[PDB]
Amino acid sequence: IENGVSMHKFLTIPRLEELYNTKQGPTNPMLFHLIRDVKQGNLPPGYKITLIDIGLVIEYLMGGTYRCTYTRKRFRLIYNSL
Amino acid sequence: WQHGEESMAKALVACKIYRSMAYEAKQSDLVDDTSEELKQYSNDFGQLAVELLEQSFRQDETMAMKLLTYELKNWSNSTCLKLAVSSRLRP
Amino acid sequence: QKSWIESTLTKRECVYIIPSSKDPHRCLPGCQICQQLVRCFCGRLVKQHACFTASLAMKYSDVKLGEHFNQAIEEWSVEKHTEQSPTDAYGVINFQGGSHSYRAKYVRLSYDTKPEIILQLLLKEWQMELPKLVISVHGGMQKFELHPRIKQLLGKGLIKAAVTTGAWILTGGVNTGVAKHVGDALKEHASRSSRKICTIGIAPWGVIENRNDLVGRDVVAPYQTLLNPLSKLNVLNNLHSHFILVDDGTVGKYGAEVRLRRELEKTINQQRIHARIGQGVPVVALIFEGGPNVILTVLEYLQESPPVPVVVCEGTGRAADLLAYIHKQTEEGGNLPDAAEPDIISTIKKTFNFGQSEAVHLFQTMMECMKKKELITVFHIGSEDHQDIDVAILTALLKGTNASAFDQLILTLAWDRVDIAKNHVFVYGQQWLVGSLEQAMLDALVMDRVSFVKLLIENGVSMHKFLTIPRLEELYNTKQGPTNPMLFHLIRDVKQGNLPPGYKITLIDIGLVIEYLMGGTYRCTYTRKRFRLIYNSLETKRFPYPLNELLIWACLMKRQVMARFLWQHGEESMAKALVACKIYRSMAYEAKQSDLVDDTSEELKQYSNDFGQLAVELLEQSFRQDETMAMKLLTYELKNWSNSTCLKLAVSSRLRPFVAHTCTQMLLSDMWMGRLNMRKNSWYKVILSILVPPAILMLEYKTKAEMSHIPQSQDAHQMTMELPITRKFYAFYHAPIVKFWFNTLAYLGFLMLYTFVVLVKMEQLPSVQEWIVIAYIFTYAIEKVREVFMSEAGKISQKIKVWFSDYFNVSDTIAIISFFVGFGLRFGAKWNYINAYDNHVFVAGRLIYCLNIIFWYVRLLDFLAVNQQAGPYVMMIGKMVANMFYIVVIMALVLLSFGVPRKAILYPHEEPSWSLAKDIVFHPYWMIFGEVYAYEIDVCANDSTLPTICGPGTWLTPFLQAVYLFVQYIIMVNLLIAFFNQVYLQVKAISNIVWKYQRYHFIMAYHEKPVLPPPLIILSHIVSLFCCVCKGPKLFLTEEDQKKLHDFEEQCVEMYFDEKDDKFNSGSEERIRVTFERVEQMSIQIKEVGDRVNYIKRSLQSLDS
Amino acid sequence: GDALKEHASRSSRKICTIGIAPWGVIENRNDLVGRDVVAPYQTLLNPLSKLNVLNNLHSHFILVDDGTVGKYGAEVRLRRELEKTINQQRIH
């Protein structure tokens, strides 16, 4: 950051999809347990997490009427587009 | 957290994420506890907010009360004082 | 427009097309290549000239057909071939990435902007407060390199000599010039993250990357600095606030930006520093490593008028090295070693890869530089030359612009740099025209510059000479400095109206404030006839004691740091710190009362209590030096502060740590004795002497050499001067301790009689024991009437308000009224001879007595509180009754929670009644106090006192009552116990102070109480009033004793300001602080020095080998 | 006197400097003319001045009076004549 990485340029959708979907670093087993709960089922075998699935967590974690950028129609439409 | 903006709404969302994760840990036991490692992580964010409110209240008591009620619009049209109440942050 | 910026400023665009190349490097029909690779003297390409009409001028090749006298065009007039337009850019650069998204601003203006047009946006649009200094940096444009010492040391100064001042640094902005290194200092030496040094970096629209990103009206340009070495456009340096993007119509090239830089650096030298100062904001110039055009422009400052100085530093590099290398030669300019001019030109030859044909004029340019070796401050970075660079810059301005030491002082007074003054203005032999020093004090005072006040006092400004009437009239009437809005609100109140439009405050109007703030009978010098006559008239137009007039000024204008400075100077330091504490405290109460501005009211009560603690810490220092004289310091009439006292002031400021200090508590006891010596005597002998008057003569009195420190009455001092027997009875009976124990034995003879009347039957007429009782209260009433009329004031509205403000003057009024209601109904009534107590008027007054009696037994806690063990419990019995009200409301919510069900469940056939108001409150209250009503619980049980209350639902009450008492005793009563345990140590360390402070008002009520007790005090009223129809306790010091006392106060103040100095400078946390700061400054001169040693030994062994 | 301030001892009866002054090189000589008078003395550092102001940090003075003004003289006589009788008084 102190040598010229403006996160606006480096935070695209597919990059940040990885950052959740990496065992290549310190991981939290809750996140793969939360996502399978809100989906109300069982994750398929491979299952790269989608950012929609994260919104369904944070809107579940924060709770009440919290509505995250990920679940909204704008993001949900440019996401399935790409 | 310390980078970006909205540093008082980010430290009260964080404190509510962890706190709401910790309560899932205690509820379901599929792994090691982790649940007191988070409640110390939440209360670490839920104390930078409070120590940042004081720093504002000690600079302008008026505006520092606007910092508690301005609709945020990045954090779901919410408030830096409705979050704390949701994290049950008393300080 | 909604934007004054683009309403005023404009933008240059090349509105015409001028090719600059003709030869077809490729594709012989030049029209094709001229499209994409033939640029204008506009700098931009011929097709980048969109300019909508010029976009259609992208015909076959462009404007001006190929031949057109081939060499014809090649000029690009910036006047008509480059028109103006409203600015399309103006926003805030984001600098996305690098430190918390630090901000900066711009417009993209044209250099067309006249110099005055450029200044009149920087202030009002960007809200950049006017500077005290200007540190334009005119060094090298191409990047250069420095040594680790000079890198950070020059980064100390550009932070130091600019954070103190305002210092609009003028840079190039780009991250390649001097703009590069200056920004690196702003981060390494990152000041307190605030409005730091606002660097106003003029940028060209030429060497600039992301120029398109700047094109936005109110747009946060998402700017990002690429360090791509293939890049050529220069990115703006990171640490720079507000930019000026000078727009010449061209791109990539230099030019116009240099024009603006003079043209703002010349109008800021035309703006004034501050309303008080008449000078203009000066301008300096700093050089880092320079260049060929630099050596030219360094000089023209030294030539042009006004003589803008320069701070060319020697260590930086190429040009600046040699401009300073020549300073080590070429002594006083014209003297020139002709053998060195080949040598230095040989140094010029090697640095700039420089020509010898050009070696005369560039060398010549360094001559007129050296002809002006007075204001070219060649800072020798190596040594301590003139100091660290911070001082060098500020020192360069003073010494060199042909300015008087006054004119040098008025600048440093604006900068608020005292160290400049103590070591470059107050140095040595120097003219110091005395009238000048005076005028400078007038300016340091109106602002707040305490440090120059101290400086000027310590260089010969006797305030007696400099405090005349018209000067001090200003000091109130200046908005040219930190002001207090109260003062203009107080003055319009006491005048009872509205100030006229202009209204310079008169010092009379101030007296009407201080006599209102301090209050009571305080009468200030200003309102008196002497001052009021010499004032309207206009060394008589001076003041006797000036720092008594400035100290009441700095406390009305909320200038603490001056008040602490003017307090510690002068004399009467303990009366000045208790007047101040009363001024602020009396200002704070006006703030809370009227809300026309921000509160300010807790900013003062901390300012008062800061003066009301230096007094107390100065009493202790005296009491610890001579307990006797230190009790004279509390009672000597002051005569500068309205014939007042350093202990009547504290009482008016309600300052408890002074009145309840151990020196105001010995004196109050030495005043409690009187002439008696109740050290040698005993309390038995007082009472023995009051009832046996001859035993007065067998008492051990004090001598008038022991009563020196005690204040004595008017005629009391007359006695001692001119022990005889008539002066034994006068000395005893006029002692407070005697006045006390001569009432307490009439009052305890009052309470033994009234009690006797209360308890014993009461006949048609009062008895002997009852007339004496009426007589006490009457004469006790009069004694409280007279206590009003003589309560040392003029306002009846204020006397009456301070009388009823004491707890007992009300209760006594309740108890005196009630008694004569009682005697009214008791005596003013009929008599039913067959049976008394049938007359409900008689009964009524009878029962006023039996209840009025309670007022008089609680009096005894006034008398009983004289003791130092008892009183501090009598004061607790109140501070808990207050703080416990809410535990006791709950206990009455629990008491009706039980009483209303218990009374409904058990007594269900109740018509409305007043017994439903008792019976829901009665038993549940006595339950709290040991009672259970055991044979009334379970009314259906066999062992019942209430076998008639049995019926449907009455089995619920044992449960209700079980829950009730559990809540009362086991929860709420132990909440009281727990309360009284934890509010005991608090209220005990307060009830002492509340007691020691009511002691003043008790003892100093006996010094003006009569001698005779309130059954026969009437004689001492009779024999004070009919004698009054025919027509305080002061410290009588001779003349030398005033002198010995003043010598004592001066001595004790000196120690106070000297022991605090020791307790801090020779503590621990301060001593770790110094040991840190030493080992800092050591370790710098360890590694530096120790390096050099190694650079010797590696040589020394090679010198000999 | 400059040492008496830089190294300002505990503010008390410090070293009582008994500075013999002549009635010669002395400014504000008229201000000194007062029987039991607090001479409102002020040191002017006017470089145009020629009369020498008393140094700040000095307690008790001896203003030796020769009848003349501006010139030296008599003061040196006293200085032996006190420095010779104090060598005649005993320490204790």
Ligand SMILES: CCCCCCCC/C=C/CCCCCCCC(=O)O[C@@H](COC(=O)CCCCCCCCCCCCCCC)COP(=O)([O-])OCC[N+](C)(C)C
């Ligand atoms: C014998 C048969 C009849 C009598 C038996 C029954 C007697 C009933 C009980 C009586 C108890 C009497 C003592 C308490 C009353 C206050 C005393 C006082 O000085 O208070 C204050 C004066 O505060 C003021 O503001 C100035 C004057 C207030 C007068 C208020 C009278 C209230 C009592 C109504 C009349 C009752 C008379 C009923 C009779 C018609 C002193 O201060 P403080 O109180 O320590 O604290 C408050 C602080 N304050 C000053 C900022 C406010």
Ligand SMILES: CCCCCCCC/C=C/CCCCCCCC(=O)O[C@@H](COC(=O)CCCCCCCCCCCCCCC)COP(=O)([O-])OCC[N+](C)(C)C
């Ligand atoms: C420092 C200031 C604080 C102290 C305040 C001090 C002032 C004190 C304040 C007092 C105010 C209270 C009111 C006045 C009291 C009487 C009220 C009353 O009811 O009177 C009654 C008697 O009235 C008579 O005239 C006959 C008896 C003599 C009156 C003696 C009371 C006045 C004494 C005052 C000496 C005070 C001077 C003290 C010296 C300064 C009238 O009613 P009644 O006759 O019962 O009705 C008949 C009914 N029946 C026939 C059916 C039976």
Ligand SMILES: CCCCCCCC/C=C/CCCCCCCC(=O)O[C@@H](COC(=O)CCCCCCCCCCCCCCC)COP(=O)([O-])OCC[N+](C)(C)C
């Ligand atoms: C159902 C029953 C329910 C209860 C009924 C009531 C009973 C309980 C209550 C009783 C008294 C209520 C009124 C007076 C007290 C109020 C004031 C106080 O508490 O302290 C205040 C004054 O007072 C003092 O500082 C001194 C305390 C005086 C002692 C009280 C005598 C009680 C004895 C009577 C024995 C007679 C017994 C027999 C009677 C027949 C001090 O408080 P503070 O915190 O400093 O506040 C600020 C003060 N300031 C503004 C001056 C700075």
Ligand SMILES: CCCCCCCC/C=C/CCCCCCCC(=O)O[C@@H](COC(=O)CCCCCCCCCCCCCCC)COP(=O)([O-])OCC[N+](C)(C)C
């Ligand atoms: C939730 C928190 C925990 C609570 C703890 C337990 C709570 C309490 C539990 C108590 C146990 C239950 C007791 C009542 C049982 C029935 C009584 C009955 O049948 O008749 C009785 C009627 O009298 C009553 O019913 C009155 C209620 C009893 C007293 C309540 C307890 C209070 C003291 C203890 C509270 C703390 C004790 C602590 C416990 C160790 C008597 O017989 P009878 O003949 O019908 O009446 C005489 C009429 N005759 C003369 C006309 C014939």
Ligand SMILES: CCCCCCCC/C=C/CCCCCCCC(=O)O[C@@H](COC(=O)CCCCCCCCCCCCCCC)COP(=O)([O-])OCC[N+](C)(C)C
């Ligand atoms: C805890 C250890 C001790 C033992 C525990 C074992 C418990 C066993 C208990 C069992 C209760 C049942 C027995 C009574 C019914 C039979 C008839 C009877 O006597 O009726 C009575 C109703 O009195 C009651 O109903 C009593 C209270 C019932 C609740 C018992 C306590 C609950 C537990 C505790 C928590 C409760 C809350 C407490 C606060 C937290 C009326 O009879 P009387 O009063 O004589 O009136 C007769 C006259 N009359 C006809 C004119 C009206």
Ligand SMILES: CCCCCCCC/C=C\CCCCCCCC(=O)O[C@@H](COC(=O)CCCCCCCCCCCCCCC)COP(=O)([O-])OCC[N+](C)(C)C
């Ligand atoms: C305002 C201030 C005044 C100052 C005080 C001095 C002036 C006041 C003094 C005296 C006034 C009274 C004089 C009149 C004659 C007395 C008659 C009488 O009652 O006699 C009784 C005694 O006396 C008492 O019982 C009442 C008087 C004395 C005790 C109460 C007051 C004590 C306080 C004041 C002194 C100590 C103070 C110490 C405190 C530190 C005896 O008679 P009896 O009981 O009726 O029974 C007789 C027998 N027979 C019925 C069978 C026949």
Ligand SMILES: CCCCCCCC/C=C\CCCCCCCC(=O)O[C@@H](COC(=O)CCCCCCCCCCCCCCC)COP(=O)([O-])OCC[N+](C)(C)C
């Ligand atoms: C300055 C302030 C003054 C205060 C107000 C002054 C008020 C003055 C008020 C009254 C004076 C006049 C008295 C007569 C009243 C009319 C009724 C009447 O005549 O007789 C009736 C009296 O009935 C009662 O109730 C008498 C007692 C009431 C007194 C209440 C005072 C409260 C003040 C508390 C202390 C205040 C403390 C203040 C603290 C600051 C009945 O009696 P009778 O008919 O004569 O004959 C017997 C009847 N029988 C046949 C049935 C047996």
Ligand SMILES: CCCCCCCC/C=C\CCCCCCCC(=O)O[C@@H](COC(=O)CCCCCCCCCCCCCCC)COP(=O)([O-])OCC[N+](C)(C)C
């Ligand atoms: C007529 C014949 C003669 C005898 C009659 C008189 C007998 C005596 C009467 C009372 C008792 C006091 C006697 C001892 C006094 C010692 C001196 C002393 O220190 O006094 C203190 C208290 O001073 C007071 O005045 C306290 C109040 C007493 C009078 C009111 C009665 C309260 C008690 C009744 C309540 C109801 C209880 C009812 C219980 C049934 C004040 O001084 P200090 O600050 O403590 O001083 C110590 C340091 N110094 C000395 C160096 C200064």
Ligand SMILES: CCCCCCCC/C=C\CCCCCCCC(=O)O[C@@H](COC(=O)CCCCCCCCCCCCCCC)COP(=O)([O-])OCC[N+](C)(C)C
């Ligand atoms: C020891 C206590 C009694 C003596 C009273 C005399 C001393 C009282 C002295 C100081 C205390 C506080 C100030 C005085 C009260 C003013 C009103 C008030 O504050 O109301 C408060 C609510 O209060 C309620 O809601 C109470 C209403 C019901 C009163 C019933 C009394 C019950 C006790 C009857 C006995 C049954 C006992 C049963 C068995 C134990 C409102 O809060 P506030 O005003 O913002 O707060 C205080 C602000 N202040 C401090 C600046 C003023």
Ligand SMILES: CCCCCCCC/C=C\CCCCCCCC(=O)O[C@@H](COC(=O)CCCCCCCCCCCCCCC)COP(=O)([O-])OCC[N+](C)(C)C
């Ligand atoms: C009458 C007024 C009513 C209106 C209220 C006044 C308000 C209060 C004002 C003022 C207060 C003081 C003066 C008035 C009260 C005392 C005088 C008095 O009334 O004596 C009475 C005589 O009483 C006796 O002969 C019995 C013993 C007492 C005599 C000495 C008086 C008491 C005070 C001594 C020590 C302190 C004094 C020393 C000071 C240096 C006369 O009263 P009377 O009602 O005319 O007579 C009725 C019948 N009787 C004769 C049987 C009693």
Ligand SMILES: C[C@@H]1CC[C@@]2(OC1)O[C@H]1C[C@H]3[C@@H]4CC=C5C[C@@H](OCCC(CO)CO)CC[C@]5(C)[C@H]4CC[C@]3(C)[C@H]1[C@@H]2C
């Ligand atoms: C917050 C708290 C809740 C509880 C409570 O305080 C406030 O609410 C209050 C209301 C009161 C009643 C109002 C009116 C009357 C009528 C009157 O009728 C006279 C008739 C006749 C007599 O014979 C005249 O001749 C008798 C008294 C009674 C019932 C009051 C009793 C006390 C009560 C219950 C008070 C109780 C302590």
Ligand SMILES: c1ccc2c(c1)CCC[C@H]2Nc1nc2ccccc2[nH]1
């Ligand atoms: C009950 C008891 C005393 C008191 C009150 C209430 C209300 C305030 C006045 C106070 N009286 C008092 N007498 C004193 C004698 C000596 C020193 C301090 C004293 N304070």
Ligand SMILES: [Ca+2]
């Ligand atoms: Ca009990």
